[PDB]
């Protein structure tokens, strides 16, 4: 429900970080979104669920 490359807010731990969507994938009856956290290396890039995403 989010285009790739789209800038969003992604929740990691307690707060939301400004992020960018790198991949969108569907599997096992569910969406999962690979995001980059602006300010942080590829190291910190990770998959996350819809729950954790927020439209800018």
Numbering used by the authors: 51 to 106
The authors write:
MRG1 and MRG2 belong to the MRG protein family, with highly conserved members in fungi, plants, and animals. Members in this group have the same domain organization, with a chromodomain (chromatin organization modifier domain) near the N-terminus, and a MRG domain near the C-terminus. Firstly, via their chromodomain, MRG1/2 proteins act as readers that recognize methylated H3K4 and H3K36. In addition, MRG1/2 proteins bind to chromatin that contains tri-methylated H3K4 and H3K36 via their chromodomains, the bound MRG1/2 in turn stabilize the binding of CO and ultimately controls the activation of FT transcription.
To identify H3K36 methylation readers, we performed an in vitro peptide pull-down experiment using Arabidopsis nuclear extracts, and identified among proteins detected with mass spectrometry the Arabidopsis Morf Related Gene (MRG) group protein MRG2 as a binding protein of the histone H3 N-terminal tail methylated at lysine 36. However, the predicted alpha-helix located at the C-terminus is missing in the electron density map. The tri-methylated lysine projects into the aromatic cage formed by the His62, Tyr67, Tyr87, Trp90, and Trp94 residues of the MRG2 chromodomain. The co-crystal structures clearly indicate that the chromodomain of MRG2 can directly bind to tri-methylated H3K4 and H3K36, and provide strong evidence that the aromatic cage of the MRG2 chromodomain and the associated residues are essential for the binding, the same as other chromodomain proteins.
